[PDB]
Design an enzyme around this catalytic site. Structure first.
Site, PDB file in Angstrom:
ATOM      1  N   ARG A 524       0.797  -1.211   0.000  1.00 18.43           N
ATOM      2  CA  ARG A 524       0.000   0.000   0.000  1.00 18.43           C
ATOM      3  C   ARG A 524       0.839   1.275   0.000  1.00 18.43           C
ATOM      4  O   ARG A 524       1.989   1.258   0.407  1.00 18.43           O
ATOM      5  CB  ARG A 524      -0.934  -0.006   1.197  1.00 18.43           C
ATOM      6  CG  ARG A 524      -0.226  -0.171   2.505  1.00 18.43           C
ATOM      7  CD  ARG A 524      -1.165   0.110   3.659  1.00 18.43           C
ATOM      8  NE  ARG A 524      -1.800  -1.108   4.147  1.00 18.43           N
ATOM      9  CZ  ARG A 524      -3.106  -1.342   4.077  1.00 18.43           C
ATOM     10  NH1 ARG A 524      -3.917  -0.437   3.536  1.00 18.43           N
ATOM     11  NH2 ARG A 524      -3.604  -2.474   4.559  1.00 18.43           N
ATOM     12  N   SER A 588      10.025  -4.733   4.161  1.00 19.26           N
ATOM     13  CA  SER A 588      10.133  -5.847   5.101  1.00 19.26           C
ATOM     14  C   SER A 588      11.040  -6.985   4.679  1.00 19.26           C
ATOM     15  O   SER A 588      10.578  -8.110   4.514  1.00 19.26           O
ATOM     16  CB  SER A 588       8.754  -6.418   5.398  1.00 19.26           C
ATOM     17  OG  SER A 588       7.749  -5.430   5.219  1.00 19.26           O
ATOM     18  N   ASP A 642       9.395  -3.301   8.770  1.00 16.04           N
ATOM     19  CA  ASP A 642       8.089  -3.271   9.419  1.00 16.04           C
ATOM     20  C   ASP A 642       8.094  -3.471  10.927  1.00 16.04           C
ATOM     21  O   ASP A 642       7.212  -2.973  11.630  1.00 16.04           O
ATOM     22  CB  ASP A 642       7.169  -4.299   8.778  1.00 16.04           C
ATOM     23  CG  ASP A 642       7.797  -5.672   8.692  1.00 16.04           C
ATOM     24  OD1 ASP A 642       8.981  -5.800   9.053  1.00 16.04           O
ATOM     25  OD2 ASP A 642       7.102  -6.620   8.268  1.00 16.04           O
TER      26      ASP A 642
END
Ligand SMILES: O=P(O)(O)OC[C@H]1O[C@@H](O)[C@H](O)[C@@H](O)[C@@H]1O
Ligand SMILES: O=P(O)(O)OC[C@H]1O[C@@H](O)[C@H](O)[C@@H](O)[C@@H]1O
Ligand SMILES: OC[C@H]1O[C@@H](O)[C@H](O)[C@@H](O)[C@@H]1O
Ligand SMILES: OC[C@H]1O[C@@H](O)[C@H](O)[C@@H](O)[C@@H]1O
Ligand SMILES: [Ca+2]
Ligand SMILES: [Ca+2]
EC number: 2.7.1.1
Length: 899
Positions: A524, A588, A642
């Site tokens: 996103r 990540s 993350d």
């Protein structure tokens, strides 16, 4: 002619009319319904207890078993050998043992010591001790069971009255006595009631047997009920044998209007006052005395023996049921009555011998009649189940009174056929006893036990002890260090990569930023506005963008081109397409940082596999893609993992949040290390955020200790065979696969789905995180589990569903514990670093598996608490995602860039 009509007048009450017999029948029929209902069962007197016996012998039964038969008139032990396969047909040798009115009425301990001694002797006389022969237990008493090898005594009946047994498990009680002997080893595989044993026996010879009936010391019956009718047993498939335990019919006073003062008096002198009332008007254990009670009541009115009443005619149990029988013989009927009444002291007038013998008929006829009314209610229930208009069924029978009494059998069948006409019933008498039938049950029970033993042996490898968990915690720490020390970092598996974030939000972060979230389930793009001071606020908008797996495993070129395209579209979306905005990039994956804006992709993990990316700087890789498009201009101020992004998000509100954790597609953790410990980054001032990348824990073998065949297969088929071994026993992207693999194996061994490996079962990824989480819900019902499975394409019975759910639990539980041992190591290091004897710290968490799974977090938290009792950890869940934390890092990045 009137003498007869004389007693038929006195014992009028004991003369039941057919219309009456029908009434009782209808009554029992209702007692059966209440007993089987989950709503009324708790109040019913007719227990309708399930037996866990679903069918009579099929013929496939074979082996060498030992059977015990306690509760009848004789304690008998037998050995039944059966094996058609080879050639052998059913053979059995039995022995009878004495049981004094001492043991039977003593302490349970004394009783079971005897049973254990008798079994020992039996096995010695045959010298079969060395053999672990399965033992079947025929216990003729009401028992609560949740499984065939468990039998909790509800209450004693008949002649037994041993203390310390009611409410206990006779299996466990018997197992103790044997073990206490050390003489041999018992393998009690099942416990069956004699009515069930009797049915099993007659069924062997007559495959139409659906009822087991006993009329001896006591009376009871069992039948084959539809599983969909047995509320107290989850399942709607097939049939199961219900042990009615009708001897307690009317114990709630539903037969008071049929019981006589002779009945009540018989009760007031019984061992169990108030119970087994229906049975007290039938079984051979009470027939005799019930008569001697009237003889006395008659003599006391001069109606017999010239009103004479000897001390014998008054002594309890001086008139056996044996008498009641011999006195009813056709041949020497009255002649017998004479000899008997004579020894009774009283002077037997050849006219008395007649008056007496008749009384016997009345009493002995009421029994046969009563039984015929209830048994009739059962046959009617069977007929109802089949739907057919008529009924054809066989009924197994056994018990002294029936087996040894001139008229009982005769009159019994008569009234019966009269009461139930629309049915053709055959009465087969168990000639062998319960033994054959018990053995037939033990065969299958044992068959299912080995299956179970095997299933448990396998699953047992997924069980970690507290001690194993401390070792993992220990190992985690050792590896944590090797990675921080610059001299050993070179070959450390847990790379402890520095993030170049040295402080949690100070509360001064201000501005507008763009952020990227790549790595989790949803890629996103976001826009985050942070305002501090007076009006401290955070406003963020985002939008999800897909990423075809083709691009995901395509080439670094197309990948980052695609990303930029998405970044463009979002800029339009938000409208902010124009100026040069600072951007935080949440990537990540394991990166080697030199600064807050330089990340060399060390290696790919999870499902990503783009080409020409490993080895490069992702910031650059992105910078280029941006330059190529030439649609806008950005300021990539930072690259963030993350776990670190999560920590900052949560630390923005909770100042004690110094640890980050992710348990979703993959699993990783981060925390705040002391700069003096980070030998890889110059300085020993303040702290630095360390992205552990702990998924690689075990990649050097330190975990091969607890990894299983299924863990190895899952690893061997992954995109990255050999790496990220720890994370592969924890994250949502792999858990499912461990399960699938365990299931396929059980299927091949014929423990699931009839041994058929379906295409679905062969589809990798079938068990999503979302499914593992539904299947384990505690609010779920077996019917629902089976539904879910069938939706997936797996044709599963209810028994299948149970095993699948179990498997899912074992695997998911181990995942939480291993994860806790990992986190436990982290917090205790933060505590030793701060030289504390107690540390309070909260952890910022995120990840679909963590959020959706019904037990993971709970079991995890529990484990951390148990392994690090000197830390009070709290887990705060990130509900806004990494974005907020990435922007809060980008802010400082800028602040240090401007300066
Ligand atoms: O009538 P009884 O002597 O009391 O016994 C009747 C039946 O009781 C069961 O418990 C035994 O397993 C059978 O072997 C026996 O035939
Ligand atoms: O379970 P996952 O799909 O792996 O998600 C876990 C987390 O992944 C990170 O990459 C994202 O920054 C988070 O916003 C997300 O919650
Ligand atoms: O032995 C036959 C029957 O006797 C009754 O007294 C018991 O309640 C039953 O458990 C048993 O099936
Ligand atoms: O997605 C969560 C974690 O997954 C791991 O496999 C990655 O290597 C980490 O960088 C990441 O923090
Ligand atoms: Ca049911
Ligand atoms: Ca340092």
């Amino acid at each position: 002619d009137d003498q007869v009509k004389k007693i038929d007048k006195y014992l009028y009450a004991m003369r039941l009319s057919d219309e009456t017999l029908i009434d009782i029948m209808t009554r029992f029929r209702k007692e059966m319904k209440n007993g089987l209902s989950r709503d009324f069962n708790p109040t019913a007197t007719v227990k309708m207890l399930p037996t866990f016996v679903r069918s009579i012998p099929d013929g496939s039964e074979k082996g060498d078993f030992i059977a015990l038969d306690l509760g009848g008139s004789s304690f008998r032990i037998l050995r039944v050998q059966v094996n058609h396969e080879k050639n052998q047909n059913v053979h059995m040798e039995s022995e009878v043992y004495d049981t004094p009115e001492n043991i039977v009425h003593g302490s349970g301990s004394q009783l079971f010591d005897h049973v254990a001694e008798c079994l020992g002797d039996f096995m010695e006389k045959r010298k079969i001790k060395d053999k672990k022969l399965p033992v079947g237990f025929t216990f003729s008493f009401p028992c609560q069971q949740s499984k065939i090898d468990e039998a909790i005594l509800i209450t004693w009946t008949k002649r037994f009255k041993a203390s310390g047994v009611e409410g206990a498990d006779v299996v466990k009680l018997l197992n103790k006595a044997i073990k206490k002997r050390g003489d041999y080893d018992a393998n009690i595989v099942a416990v069956v009631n004699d009515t069930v044993g009797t049915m099993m026996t007659c069924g062997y010879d007559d495959q139409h047997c659906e009822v087991g009936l006993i009329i001896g010391t006591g009376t009871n019956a069992c039948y084959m009920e539809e599983l969909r009718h047995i509320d107290l047993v989850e399942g709607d498939e097939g049939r199961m044998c219900i042990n009615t335990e009708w001897g307690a019919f009317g114990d709630d006073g539903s037969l008071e209007d049929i019981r006589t003062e002779f009945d009540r008096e018989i009760d007031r002198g019984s061992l169990n006052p108030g119970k087994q009332l229906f049975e007290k008007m039938v079984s051979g254990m009470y027939l005799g005395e019930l008569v001697r009670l009237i003889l006395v009541k008659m003599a006391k009115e001069g109606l017999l023996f010239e009103g004479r009443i000897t001390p014998e005619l008054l002594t309890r149990g001086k008139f056996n049921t044996s008498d009641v029988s011999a006195i009813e013989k056709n041949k020497e009927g009255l002649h017998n009555a004479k000899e008997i009444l004579t020894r009774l002291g009283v002077e037997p007038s050849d006219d008395d011998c007649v008056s007496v013998q008749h009384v016997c008929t009345i009493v002995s006829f009421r029994s046969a009649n009563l039984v015929a009314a209830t048994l009739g209610a059962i046959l009617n229930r069977l007929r109802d189940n089949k739907g057919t208009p008529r009924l054809r069924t066989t009924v197994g029978v056994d018990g002294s009174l029936y087996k040894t009494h001139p008229q009982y059998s005769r009159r019994f069948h008569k009234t019966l056929r009269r009461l139930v006409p629309d049915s053709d019933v055959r009465f087969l008498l168990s000639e062998s006893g319960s033994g054959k039938g018990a053995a037939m049950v033990t065969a299958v029970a044992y068959r299912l036990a080995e299956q179970h033993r095997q299933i448990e042996e396998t699953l047992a490898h997924f069980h970690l002890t507290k001690d194993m968990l401390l070792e993992v915690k220990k190992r985690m720490r050792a590896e944590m260090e090797l990675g921080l020390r610059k001299q050993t970092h070179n070959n450390a598996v847990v790379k402890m990569l520095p993030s170049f974030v040295r402080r949690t939000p100070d509360g001064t972060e201000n501005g507008d930023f763009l952020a990227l979230d790549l790595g989790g389930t949803n890629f996103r793009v976001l826009l985050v506005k942070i305002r501090s001071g007076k009006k401290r606020t955070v406003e963020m908008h985002n939008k999800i963008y897909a990423i075809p797996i083709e691009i995901m495993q395509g080439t670094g070129e197309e990948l980052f081109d695609h990303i930029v395209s998405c970044i463009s579209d979002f800029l339009d979306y938000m409208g902010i397409k124009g100026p040069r905005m600072p951007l935080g990039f949440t990537f990540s994956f394991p990166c080697q940082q030199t600064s807050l804006d330089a990340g060399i992709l060390i290696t790919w993990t999870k499902g990503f596999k783009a080409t020409d990316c490993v080895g490069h700087d992702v910031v650059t890789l992105l910078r280029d893609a941006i330059k190529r498009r030439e649609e806008f201009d950005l300021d990539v101020v930072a690259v963030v993992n993350d776990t670190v992004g999560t920590m900052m998000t949560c630390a923005y509100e909770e100042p004690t949040c110094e640890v980050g954790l992710i348990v979703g597609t993959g699993s990783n953790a981060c925390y705040m290390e002391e700069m003096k410990n980070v030998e890889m980054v110059e300085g020993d001032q303040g702290q630095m955020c360390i992205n552990m990348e702990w998924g690689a824990f075990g990649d050097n073998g330190c975990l091969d200790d607890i990894r299983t065949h299924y863990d190895r297969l899952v690893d061997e088929y992954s995109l990255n065979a050999g790496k990220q071994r720890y994370e592969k026993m924890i994250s949502g992207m792999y858990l499912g696969e461990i399960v699938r693999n365990i299931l396929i194996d059980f299927t091949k061994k014929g423990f699931l789905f009839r041994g058929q490996i379906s295409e679905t079962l062969k589809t990798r990824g079938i068990f999503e995180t979302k499914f593992l989480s539904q299947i384990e819900s505690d609010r779920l019902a077996l019917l629902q589990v089976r539904a879910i499975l069938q939706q997936l394409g797996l044709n599963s019975t209810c028994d299948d569903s149970i095993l699948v759910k179990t498997v899912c639990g074992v695997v998911s539980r181990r995942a939480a514990q291993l994860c806790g041992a990992g986190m436990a190591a982290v917090v205790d290091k933060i505590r030793e670093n701060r030289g504390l004897d107690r540390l309070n710290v909260t952890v910022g968490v995120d990840g679909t598996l963590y959020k959706l799974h019904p037990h993971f977090s709970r079991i995890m938290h529990q484990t951390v608490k148990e392994l690090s009792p000197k830390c009070n950890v709290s887990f705060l869940l990130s509900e806004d995602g990494s974005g907020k934390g990435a922007a809060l890092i980008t802010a400082v990045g800028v602040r240090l860039r401007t300066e």
